[PDB]
Design an enzyme around this catalytic site. Structure first.
Site, PDB file in Angstrom:
ATOM      1  N   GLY A   1      48.532  32.076  42.111  1.00 48.33           N
ATOM      2  CA  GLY A   1      49.730  31.314  41.719  1.00 48.33           C
ATOM      3  C   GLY A   1      49.614  30.634  40.362  1.00 48.33           C
ATOM      4  O   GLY A   1      48.695  30.919  39.589  1.00 48.33           O
ATOM      5  N   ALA A   2      50.543  29.715  40.098  1.00 50.96           N
ATOM      6  CA  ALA A   2      50.693  29.074  38.785  1.00 50.96           C
ATOM      7  C   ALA A   2      49.427  28.412  38.226  1.00 50.96           C
ATOM      8  O   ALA A   2      49.264  28.356  37.007  1.00 50.96           O
ATOM      9  CB  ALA A   2      51.843  28.066  38.824  1.00 50.96           C
ATOM     10  N   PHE A   3      48.545  27.909  39.096  1.00 54.91           N
ATOM     11  CA  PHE A   3      47.260  27.345  38.650  1.00 54.91           C
ATOM     12  C   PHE A   3      46.119  28.374  38.769  1.00 54.91           C
ATOM     13  O   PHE A   3      44.943  28.009  38.871  1.00 54.91           O
ATOM     14  CB  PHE A   3      46.923  26.066  39.429  1.00 54.91           C
ATOM     15  N   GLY A   4      46.480  29.663  38.759  1.00 53.61           N
ATOM     16  CA  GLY A   4      45.496  30.753  38.779  1.00 53.61           C
ATOM     17  C   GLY A   4      45.319  31.406  40.137  1.00 53.61           C
ATOM     18  O   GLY A   4      46.164  31.272  41.027  1.00 53.61           O
TER      19      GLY A   4
ATOM     20  N   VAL B   1      43.270  32.017  43.742  1.00 50.19           N
ATOM     21  CA  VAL B   1      42.502  31.373  44.811  1.00 50.19           C
ATOM     22  C   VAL B   1      41.593  32.441  45.430  1.00 50.19           C
ATOM     23  O   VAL B   1      42.042  33.545  45.728  1.00 50.19           O
ATOM     24  CB  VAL B   1      43.429  30.797  45.907  1.00 50.19           C
ATOM     25  CG1 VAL B   1      42.616  30.095  47.019  1.00 50.19           C
ATOM     26  CG2 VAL B   1      44.471  29.863  45.287  1.00 50.19           C
TER      27      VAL B   1
ATOM     28  N   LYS C   1      39.950  27.241  44.936  1.00 55.11           N
ATOM     29  CA  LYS C   1      40.827  27.128  43.777  1.00 55.11           C
ATOM     30  C   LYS C   1      39.961  26.993  42.510  1.00 55.11           C
ATOM     31  O   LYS C   1      39.008  26.210  42.481  1.00 55.11           O
ATOM     32  CB  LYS C   1      41.749  25.919  43.922  1.00 55.11           C
ATOM     33  CG  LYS C   1      42.642  25.961  45.152  1.00 55.11           C
ATOM     34  CD  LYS C   1      43.276  24.603  45.484  1.00 55.11           C
ATOM     35  CE  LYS C   1      44.202  24.081  44.411  1.00 55.11           C
ATOM     36  NZ  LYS C   1      45.577  24.700  44.455  1.00 55.11           N
TER      37      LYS C   1
ATOM     38  N   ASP D   1      55.659  18.535  48.850  1.00 51.79           N
ATOM     39  CA  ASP D   1      55.885  19.972  48.697  1.00 51.79           C
ATOM     40  C   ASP D   1      55.707  20.715  50.023  1.00 51.79           C
ATOM     41  O   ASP D   1      55.056  21.764  50.097  1.00 51.79           O
ATOM     42  CB  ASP D   1      54.978  20.544  47.614  1.00 51.79           C
ATOM     43  CG  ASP D   1      55.511  21.848  47.023  1.00 51.79           C
ATOM     44  OD1 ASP D   1      56.746  22.085  47.048  1.00 51.79           O
ATOM     45  OD2 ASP D   1      54.683  22.656  46.557  1.00 51.79           O
TER      46      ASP D   1
ATOM     47  N   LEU E   1      42.203  35.528  47.869  1.00 50.16           N
ATOM     48  CA  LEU E   1      43.180  35.187  48.899  1.00 50.16           C
ATOM     49  C   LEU E   1      44.609  35.234  48.338  1.00 50.16           C
ATOM     50  O   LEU E   1      45.464  35.974  48.825  1.00 50.16           O
ATOM     51  CB  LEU E   1      42.882  33.790  49.454  1.00 50.16           C
ATOM     52  CG  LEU E   1      41.572  33.649  50.218  1.00 50.16           C
ATOM     53  CD1 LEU E   1      41.343  32.190  50.640  1.00 50.16           C
ATOM     54  CD2 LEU E   1      41.568  34.590  51.416  1.00 50.16           C
ATOM     55  N   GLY E   2      44.854  34.442  47.304  1.00 46.60           N
ATOM     56  CA  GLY E   2      46.159  34.371  46.668  1.00 46.60           C
ATOM     57  C   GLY E   2      46.056  34.306  45.159  1.00 46.60           C
ATOM     58  O   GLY E   2      44.999  34.548  44.572  1.00 46.60           O
TER      59      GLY E   2
HETATM   60  N1  LIG Z   1      42.552  26.427  53.103  1.00 46.97           N
HETATM   61  C1  LIG Z   1      43.050  27.663  52.882  1.00 46.97           C
HETATM   62  N2  LIG Z   1      42.703  28.672  53.711  1.00 46.97           N
HETATM   63  C2  LIG Z   1      43.384  29.732  53.203  1.00 46.97           C
HETATM   64  N3  LIG Z   1      43.261  30.947  53.822  1.00 46.97           N
HETATM   65  C3  LIG Z   1      43.896  32.134  53.536  1.00 46.97           C
HETATM   66  C4  LIG Z   1      44.770  32.318  52.458  1.00 46.97           C
HETATM   67  C5  LIG Z   1      45.369  33.552  52.235  1.00 46.97           C
HETATM   68  C6  LIG Z   1      45.126  34.642  53.085  1.00 46.97           C
HETATM   69  S1  LIG Z   1      45.881  36.045  52.797  1.00 46.97           S
HETATM   70  N4  LIG Z   1      45.686  36.590  51.303  1.00 46.97           N
HETATM   71  O1  LIG Z   1      47.281  35.789  53.012  1.00 46.97           O
HETATM   72  O2  LIG Z   1      45.456  37.062  53.723  1.00 46.97           O
HETATM   73  C7  LIG Z   1      44.269  34.463  54.176  1.00 46.97           C
HETATM   74  C8  LIG Z   1      43.657  33.228  54.387  1.00 46.97           C
HETATM   75  N5  LIG Z   1      44.127  29.450  52.100  1.00 46.97           N
HETATM   76  N6  LIG Z   1      43.904  28.065  51.921  1.00 46.97           N
HETATM   77  C9  LIG Z   1      44.535  27.356  50.886  1.00 46.97           C
HETATM   78  S2  LIG Z   1      44.189  25.823  50.572  1.00 46.97           S
HETATM   79  N7  LIG Z   1      45.488  28.167  50.312  1.00 46.97           N
HETATM   80  C10 LIG Z   1      46.419  27.749  49.408  1.00 46.97           C
HETATM   81  C11 LIG Z   1      47.626  27.191  49.857  1.00 46.97           C
HETATM   82  F1  LIG Z   1      47.997  27.297  51.134  1.00 46.97           F
HETATM   83  C12 LIG Z   1      48.489  26.528  48.985  1.00 46.97           C
HETATM   84  C13 LIG Z   1      48.148  26.372  47.644  1.00 46.97           C
HETATM   85  C14 LIG Z   1      46.935  26.882  47.191  1.00 46.97           C
HETATM   86  C15 LIG Z   1      46.067  27.548  48.068  1.00 46.97           C
HETATM   87  F2  LIG Z   1      44.901  28.022  47.577  1.00 46.97           F
HETATM   88 CL   LIG Z   2      46.276  31.217  48.756  1.00 39.33          CL
END
Ligand SMILES: Nc1nc(Nc2ccc(S(N)(=O)=O)cc2)nn1C(=S)Nc1c(F)cccc1F
Ligand SMILES: [Cl-]
Ligand SMILES: Nc1nc(Nc2ccc(S(N)(=O)=O)cc2)nn1C(=S)Nc1c(F)cccc1F
Ligand SMILES: [Cl-]
EC number: 2.7.11.1
Lengths: 288, 288
Positions: free
Chosen positions: B23-26, B28, B43, B135, B20-21
């Site tokens: 960041g600084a803690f690795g 996701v 995470k 935050d 998905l993403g």
């Molecule tokens: N609960 C949750 N659902 C999602 N969904 C998600 C994230 C990214 C994407 S993307 N890569 O933008 O298409 C799609 C769906 N991300 N998410 C969390 S907690 N994301 C996230 C965040 F929003 C802030 C810090 C760390 C994280 F891992």
């Molecule tokens: Cl994310």
């Protein structure tokens, strides 16, 4: 734990000579180091479990981390056979309130000025180091053999150092950060919560002037309401006391927290411009 | 730990589908439960040691202890082979800032009102439960498949519940207790520190109105100084926005903390008197 010894019997190091006091966390013993003969107050706290050790850690850390002449030092701490032992430098004169009950009289004004001046040095140090004592009273102010005082009982104290260090910690650009957080004017850094010690200082002074604290005659259930409802307390027989005593009390015993003085401000007050403990040496000499 | 599973492999329960993403803690991951097919954000945090688990516990506890429609729920947490896994309910729409970069445009006003109204419900709940998010930004506001939002990232949040419960704890008659402590007007119970979230709410609204937050063009080293020096930010092209948007921002973006509105007060503001997510359903439909 950082400051607590495991697996060693405290009584292979410290010999109990007798009992000093006895309160809600049990009896406090007079201990004597078997090698050095150094004297200690030994708190022995029954713990049902190990998770309970966390409840006593802030106190240990404060005692171990403080280095001030008017704060009691940590000599040792042990966890052994379900008890936490805390060994604290011994103050041979006992607590201020115990002296007043033994002599059956309050302190004189000159005696109060010394206790106040030294007690204030201790608090200023604490507040500078982000510690709130939270239980200032005459029973937690101890007399040394030399006529000085040390502040004790950090059993309910707050230490905001780790929480300050944690909350200042950020990464990346803080576009969203509130200006009071930018300016380091969060509640951890403002005087507001530390000023609760200043008010207790004021009550302790009246306690030293009059043996017992204000509202001692009430049903204990009424005391909190009475503090809420009432104007701040004053000395019962004001002709007995100096304008400087009375004026110092008013800077402490002020309900508007913003208007109440900090320990920093109080150090410039003439009531604490003293530099001799001779009145206290005279007092503790009569109690010995 | 109360909410963290030991000795079990997270990937015997959850299957990684993709990233998905990052960041600084690795990184996701997008995870999917192997029994139920329920989707999660996973995470995975590298820990050098076990003492580090304490750094992540406040976040876990907040996620596990919160029960609100607009806050993300904890599905699972594992400590396995030196990594802490945190599984969080999946928000299929991703973050608000990721949508704006994909569509290369800000939110419309009606879209901001929905995010704001729901984001405010979440914060009000947090503040009522003695949690400061700390935050708030568009990147931590996630869109659900149904066009609602959930607030995420409690990685630097504060929860004052245990410290409030500890500090109210006393024994014996509290003659020395300051009236602001008697009256439950210590910093833990006053709005002051929670209002830092209100200011970040205001910045997030401008971030949603304009894609990037105020001062995004500056050298990052200058941003904190700029916040300190400057009047509060306003919308760059104010003719584009309603008086209610502009007035809501002014209640949030107010340097005098006493004068800044609480989440409670803001809920009565007409800018958040909305009860349909249709503008957000239209937005997330174009991003799908
Ligand atoms: N609960 C949750 N659902 C999602 N969904 C998600 C994230 C990214 C994407 S993307 N890569 O933008 O298409 C799609 C769906 N991300 N998410 C969390 S907690 N994301 C996230 C965040 F929003 C802030 C810090 C760390 C994280 F891992
Ligand atoms: Cl994310
Ligand atoms: N450091 C220290 N020295 C002493 N000395 C002491 C205590 C009582 C007496 S007594 N029983 O009044 O003659 C004489 C000396 N007590 N003390 C401590 S830390 N006492 C104490 C205290 F002051 C508050 C809470 C718990 C305690 F155990
Ligand atoms: Cl004692």
């Amino acid at each position: 734990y950082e400051h607590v010894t495991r697996d060693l019997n405290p009584e292979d190091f410290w010999e109990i000579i007798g009992e000093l006091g006895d309160g809600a966390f049990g009896k406090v013993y007079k201990a004597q180091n078997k090698e050095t003969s150094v004297l200690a107050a030994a708190k022995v706290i029954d713990t049902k479990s190990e998770e309970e050790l966390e409840d006593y850690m802030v106190e240990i850390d404060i005692l171990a981390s403080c280095d001030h002449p008017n704060i009691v030092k940590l000599l040792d701490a042990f966890y052994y056979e379900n008890n936490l032992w805390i060994l604290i430098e011994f103050c041979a004169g006992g607590a201020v309130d115990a002296v007043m009950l033994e002599l059956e009289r309050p302190l004189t004004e000159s005696q109060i000025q010394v206790v106040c001046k030294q007690t204030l040095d201790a608090l200023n140090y604490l507040h500078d180091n982000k510690i709130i004592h939270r239980d200032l009273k005459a029973g937690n102010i101890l007399f040394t053999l030399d006529g000085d005082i040390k502040l004790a009982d950090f059993g309910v104290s707050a230490k905001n150092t780790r929480t300050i260090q944690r909350r200042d910690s950020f990464i990346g650009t803080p576009y969203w950060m509130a200006p009071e957080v930018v300016m380091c004017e969060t509640s951890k850094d403002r005087p507001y919560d530390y000023k609760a010690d200043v008010w207790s200082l004021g009550i302790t002074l009246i306690e030293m002037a009059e043996i017992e604290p204000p509202h001692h005659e009430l049903n204990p259930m009424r005391v909190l309401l009475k503090i809420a409802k009432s104007e701040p307390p004053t000395l019962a027989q004001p002709s007995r006391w100096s304008s400087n005593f009375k004026d110092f009390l008013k800077k402490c015993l002020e309900k508007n927290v913003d208007a109440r003085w900090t320990t920093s401000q109080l150090l410039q007050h003439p009531f604490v411009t003293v530099d001799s403990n001779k009145p206290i040496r005279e007092l503790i000499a009569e109690a010995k």
